[PDB]
Design a protein around this nucleic acid. Sequence first.
RNA 1: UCAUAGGAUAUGAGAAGGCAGACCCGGGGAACUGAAACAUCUAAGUACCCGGAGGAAGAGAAAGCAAAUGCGAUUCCCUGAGUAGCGGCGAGCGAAACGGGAUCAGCCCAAACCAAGAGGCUUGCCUCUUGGGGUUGUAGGACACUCUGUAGGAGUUACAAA
RNA 2: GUGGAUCCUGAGUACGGCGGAACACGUGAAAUUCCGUCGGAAUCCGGGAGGACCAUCUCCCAAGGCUAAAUACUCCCUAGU
RNA 3: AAGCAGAAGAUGCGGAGCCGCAGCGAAAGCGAGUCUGAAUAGGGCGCAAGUACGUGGUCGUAGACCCGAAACCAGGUGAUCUACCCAUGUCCAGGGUGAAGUUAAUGGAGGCCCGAACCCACGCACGUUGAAAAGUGCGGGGAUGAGGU
RNA 4: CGGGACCUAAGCCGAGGCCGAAAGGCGUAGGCGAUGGACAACAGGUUGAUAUUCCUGUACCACCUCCUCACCAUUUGAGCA
RNA 5: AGGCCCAGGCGACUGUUUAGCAAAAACACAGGUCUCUGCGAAGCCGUAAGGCGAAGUAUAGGGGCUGACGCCUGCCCGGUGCUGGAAGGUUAAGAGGAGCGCUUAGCGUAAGCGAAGGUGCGAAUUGAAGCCCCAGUAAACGGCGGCCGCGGUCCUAAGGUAGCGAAAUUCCUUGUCGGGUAAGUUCCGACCCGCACGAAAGGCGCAACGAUCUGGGCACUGUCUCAACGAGAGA
RNA 6: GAUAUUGAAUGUUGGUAAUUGACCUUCUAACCCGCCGCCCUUAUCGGGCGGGGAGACAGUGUCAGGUGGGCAGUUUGACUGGGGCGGUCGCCUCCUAAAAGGUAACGGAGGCGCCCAAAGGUUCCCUCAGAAUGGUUGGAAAUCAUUCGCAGAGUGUAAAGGCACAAGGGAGCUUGACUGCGAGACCUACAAGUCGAGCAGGGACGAAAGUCGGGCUUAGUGAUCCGGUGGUUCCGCAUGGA
RNA 7: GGGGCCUUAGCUCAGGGGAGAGCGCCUGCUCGCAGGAGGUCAGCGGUUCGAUCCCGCUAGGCUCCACCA
Length: 249
Amino acid sequence: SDIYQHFRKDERAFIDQALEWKRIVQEQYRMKLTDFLDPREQVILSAVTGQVGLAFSGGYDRAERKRAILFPEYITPEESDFELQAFNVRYADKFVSVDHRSLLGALMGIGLKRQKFGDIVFSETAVQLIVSADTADFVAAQLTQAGKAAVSLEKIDLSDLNIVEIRDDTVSSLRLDAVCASMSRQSRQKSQTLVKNGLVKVNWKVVEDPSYIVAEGDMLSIRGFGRCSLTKIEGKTKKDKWRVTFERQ
RNA sequence: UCAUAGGAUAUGAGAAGGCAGACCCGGGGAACUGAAACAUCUAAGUACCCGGAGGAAGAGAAAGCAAAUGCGAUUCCCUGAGUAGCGGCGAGCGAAACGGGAUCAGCCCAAACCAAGAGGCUUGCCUCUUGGGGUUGUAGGACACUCUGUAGGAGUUACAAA
RNA sequence: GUGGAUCCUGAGUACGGCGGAACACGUGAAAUUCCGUCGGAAUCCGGGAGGACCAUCUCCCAAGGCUAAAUACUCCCUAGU
RNA sequence: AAGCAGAAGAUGCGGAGCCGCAGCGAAAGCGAGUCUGAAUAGGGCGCAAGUACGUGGUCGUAGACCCGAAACCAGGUGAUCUACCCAUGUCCAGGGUGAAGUUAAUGGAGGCCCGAACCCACGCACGUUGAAAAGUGCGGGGAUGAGGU
RNA sequence: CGGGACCUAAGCCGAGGCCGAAAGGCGUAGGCGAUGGACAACAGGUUGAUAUUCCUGUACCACCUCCUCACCAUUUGAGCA
RNA sequence: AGGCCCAGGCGACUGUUUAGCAAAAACACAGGUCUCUGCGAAGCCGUAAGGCGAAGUAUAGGGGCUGACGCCUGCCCGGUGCUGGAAGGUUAAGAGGAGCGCUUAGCGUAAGCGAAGGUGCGAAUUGAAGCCCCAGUAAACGGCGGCCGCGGUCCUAAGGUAGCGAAAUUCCUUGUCGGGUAAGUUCCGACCCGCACGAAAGGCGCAACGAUCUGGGCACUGUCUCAACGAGAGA
RNA sequence: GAUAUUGAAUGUUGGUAAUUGACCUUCUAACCCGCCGCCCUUAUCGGGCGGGGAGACAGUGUCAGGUGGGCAGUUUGACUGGGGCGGUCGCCUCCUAAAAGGUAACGGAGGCGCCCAAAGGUUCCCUCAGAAUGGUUGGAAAUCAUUCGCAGAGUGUAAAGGCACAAGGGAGCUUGACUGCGAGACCUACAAGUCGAGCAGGGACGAAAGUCGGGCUUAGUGAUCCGGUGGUUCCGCAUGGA
RNA sequence: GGGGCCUUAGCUCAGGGGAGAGCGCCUGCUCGCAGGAGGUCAGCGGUUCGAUCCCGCUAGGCUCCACCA
Ligand SMILES: [K+]
Ligand SMILES: [K+]
Ligand SMILES: [K+]
Ligand SMILES: [K+]
Ligand SMILES: [K+]
Ligand SMILES: [K+]
Ligand SMILES: [K+]
Ligand SMILES: [K+]
Ligand SMILES: [K+]
Ligand SMILES: [K+]
Ligand SMILES: [K+]
Ligand SMILES: [K+]
Ligand SMILES: [K+]
Ligand SMILES: [Mg+2]
Ligand SMILES: [Mg+2]
Ligand SMILES: [Mg+2]
Ligand SMILES: [Mg+2]
Ligand SMILES: [Mg+2]
Ligand SMILES: [Mg+2]
Ligand SMILES: [Mg+2]
Ligand SMILES: [Mg+2]
Ligand SMILES: [Mg+2]
Ligand SMILES: [Mg+2]
Ligand SMILES: [Mg+2]
Ligand SMILES: [Mg+2]
Ligand SMILES: [Mg+2]
Ligand SMILES: [Mg+2]
Ligand SMILES: [Mg+2]
Ligand SMILES: [Mg+2]
Ligand SMILES: [Mg+2]
Ligand SMILES: [Mg+2]
Ligand SMILES: [Mg+2]
Ligand SMILES: [Mg+2]
Ligand SMILES: [Mg+2]
Ligand SMILES: [Mg+2]
Ligand SMILES: [Mg+2]
Ligand SMILES: [Mg+2]
Ligand SMILES: [Mg+2]
Ligand SMILES: [Mg+2]
Ligand SMILES: [Mg+2]
Ligand SMILES: [Mg+2]
Ligand SMILES: [Mg+2]
Ligand SMILES: [Mg+2]
Ligand SMILES: [Mg+2]
Ligand SMILES: [Mg+2]
Ligand SMILES: [Mg+2]
Ligand SMILES: [Mg+2]
Ligand SMILES: [Mg+2]
Ligand SMILES: [Mg+2]
Ligand SMILES: [Mg+2]
Ligand SMILES: [Mg+2]
Ligand SMILES: [Mg+2]
Ligand SMILES: [Mg+2]
Ligand SMILES: [Mg+2]
Ligand SMILES: [Mg+2]
């Protein structure tokens, strides 16, 4: 009842379902695996669950979309309890490239919901994808094309997963509109339009307040400029102005 | 309901209030001031208020002082000594014992136990009330022993009281 | 006076924690004394003190009571300086 | 010294105690030396007339040469003045206006109007060792009210 | 006549009682307390000085019974209350 | 036994106030609004008992602000307050004793080791409100921009809406123009470069009301030109 | 919030070997009732008795944390061409300063609150700035070479006084940037501050003489109280320890 | 008048070792792109081998004071 105030109105939908997962694990005494929750939904679930203990894993370490196990004070989980299947994406790499957009578009095109897959890993040697095991055979059978590339999926173990733009700058304040204008290299009035409309995020939360103060180590996501991180804040310079370090993806 | 609360009556040289503007013992307790300011601290447990007294009060017969081939209740005086110490180690506060004097005095219980009676029988146990018994420290007492006294000694200032 | 078979010798006490006060002694190395609060002994093969504390030794026997004198003071009365 | 005896005296007794005769060192301690230091060195401090009483000067603690605050604190005394309240009384000449309601009339509302008593205190003058430690005179405001007493 | 031997208001006091280092604070029963309620005397005269107070005349109120008269009644029995 | 009139500021009004230099534009007020308060109410007095609140009960009671009436009351919740609250962080006494010191029966040629007890400290762990933190809230405390050419740009929590404006606010200032006068630093009406108005510390109006403040008229006069004489009180 | 007053059960979850904790719910009997009936009793007080409500909570005590101008005691510097505001406050150097020393003003100029393990000690050796003339890059200015050249440089750093038998530059070896001190001086109200030959211990460099107790000199610092750490033939409240 | 803070390209801004972003503007381009322009670093003298940077002055502008009589 008195949790919704701290989150967004749209985020209420997830919080209701997050409470329903906590309802199970307390009363019934069993682990509840979730369908790959978004980076934001990881933060929300962490709060809603409370301290029912919580574990999270999206296959490899540093996955955006991860599946969450809600377990009690016993039955500490394993890697395979998350029910993750990795695949190597096979294609005629010498003749066609697969990009992240094409592969993401193809996964969505076969009707796969965003919650049924984790990260899409691009290395120098491999293109790999992580899905929920319950959808593995469907994805392997249906994902036959990504963009212009004919593709096939080879099952691999999670152990076989083949897992910056440093920009020292100054800003007058640590407000969202100020930091965005500096990062994106725009006028502030234009940057305020990005925030107010609801295009900027801060750690995957849609911040619509221009005056929101940005902390050290916050993933900002300007729809237009992509994604970027305030990594270091190193005090004020001469004539005020915070020293800051930006790192675009 | 038994009761008890309450009510009534009788007997009380029972209390009450005052003051000597003093002294004494308690309850409560300032501030100015000093510290060259000020808060700890000081002034001060003072002034003041309150309670209780008594001709005095308080203290008093070692769970003491001490560190000797010791002392032997308390109180007060001299001295120790403005020492030891305490202290925004500042301002200041400040002993005690030993030693020398005044004065001198020591006692009664509680308990064990005994006897008698009473009311709870908890049913030969327990609790209570009288009288006896008993009074302390290199322990004493009960308890047992054998002694011994029951009228010389003591006394209304404690040690019973007219 | 002699004996140590048993029994008795002051309990919500002593003491301790916490908070205060009193001790010349301001929380200090702080004994000692008292108050509130809470906790809480041993009981003679026992207990206390000797300025934290322990051991040894020494001195003592608390948690009941009474007790003159030496001391203080003078509204008064008498005599006097 | 207290104390005892003695005129409230002198004085006698009283040697506990006090200061001095030895210092040096934080101290154990050593001693005409001692401390520092490894040191027979060097250096520091010492070595090589006090005391009891009296008068006087000054100082300390006391109000401390005298007079003087504004203040602070403690315990009392005051609401016979005044502020507000409570209970109970009482006062307010006269005139005017004319709400509601009722059937133009009737009716008689009001922190209503004019205006004495009464209450107040706006202006000016006078008074200013006053008639008066706040008034008087001429005007002024309220005057059935949140009224006066 | 005004006040008391009548009544109560505000308030005040307050047996027991409640509360509080002490002193005390509060308060019930019960009282006290007019500025209010109740309550029988008037006119005239008089002194240097009092007058519903004295005097004259004419009244009224409460209470009393040595008495008088009438009426009612002695346990469903007057009457008082 | 009323002087009257025109126009403006302030306050709606009758009231109230600095006994004894201020009666006013100050206070109050009806009305508005916010907020607290479920009754042993909140609030208040008292150490308490006992009370007021109230012999009341949310159409009631307390507190804050505003101040008839009319039209209205904009933007900002970053800060502070108030209300509520999820994760995460922090935090007392008390609880809890892992360890350690001192002591010494014993043990050791000594040096030193050292049981048990006593005693002196004591770490982890546990530990509320609160705070950090999050959300809301402006008739809560408050705040309502610069610079450059309606646009840009910087900055902010957000940059002053309506209305008003040289004002009880305007320094410059006797602003400027008009009115009124022979002549008007005052007054009235506009203007707006508001030094430094502005919406319940309300904004703007506003009939009635005022021993209010302000400007102008009629009437009237020894106030004056400019004094004279007379009466009385004192001299 | 803990703890006392403060009890009984049922669950559940700790920690010790079946007792004791933690928390949840329930109970009634403490505690509470500004609720009703009855009695004391003519009584809206109080008390008793019986219902009811609530209940080991509350209240109250002790202890603890938070909040707390509601209230209390206080502090809130001095200099100063009046005070406020501004500036300043200690140390070093120069000038004022009148040829010893000292000397004031909110007089005139600047520095300091360090730095260096060599930028210290010693032994040995050395001479700088700049210019002229010549030079592939290369220039006014890098690097040579020549001559001239009291210093026109350098000296960690402000300034003054010094310094070329160098106190300036280079190299080797070192730690005297020593311990105990100290005749005697300077300065000085005191507290402090400064210089010091020389003696002893044990060293460094040097063949030796000798020099060395930091630095060319003069700033680079802060009393006491209190507390920490290391050392210690000291004390240790009966004695041994602590 | 006294303190304080500023003055970088046309504009806004980076910063003891030699002045850069982005914008404007310019180029040629199929309305975003490639590349260029633009600097007494407000003025000055001096500390330094070097100064936009330290240091002291000097304009100009912004902010706050200019009070007691
Ligand atoms: K004081
Ligand atoms: K003083
Ligand atoms: K103590
Ligand atoms: K205790
Ligand atoms: K003893
Ligand atoms: K000597
Ligand atoms: K002599
Ligand atoms: K003398
Ligand atoms: K004197
Ligand atoms: K007023
Ligand atoms: K005029
Ligand atoms: K002057
Ligand atoms: K050398
Ligand atoms: Mg003083
Ligand atoms: Mg007596
Ligand atoms: Mg007597
Ligand atoms: Mg006695
Ligand atoms: Mg007797
Ligand atoms: Mg005894
Ligand atoms: Mg001892
Ligand atoms: Mg006071
Ligand atoms: Mg009185
Ligand atoms: Mg009175
Ligand atoms: Mg009227
Ligand atoms: Mg009168
Ligand atoms: Mg008046
Ligand atoms: Mg009138
Ligand atoms: Mg009468
Ligand atoms: Mg009373
Ligand atoms: Mg009584
Ligand atoms: Mg009367
Ligand atoms: Mg009558
Ligand atoms: Mg007469
Ligand atoms: Mg008015
Ligand atoms: Mg007045
Ligand atoms: Mg007046
Ligand atoms: Mg109450
Ligand atoms: Mg009441
Ligand atoms: Mg107002
Ligand atoms: Mg508003
Ligand atoms: Mg907020
Ligand atoms: Mg005129
Ligand atoms: Mg205003
Ligand atoms: Mg407002
Ligand atoms: Mg107004
Ligand atoms: Mg009026
Ligand atoms: Mg104050
Ligand atoms: Mg004082
Ligand atoms: Mg001064
Ligand atoms: Mg001056
Ligand atoms: Mg100043
Ligand atoms: Mg000279
Ligand atoms: Mg000279
Ligand atoms: Mg001190
Ligand atoms: Mg000892």
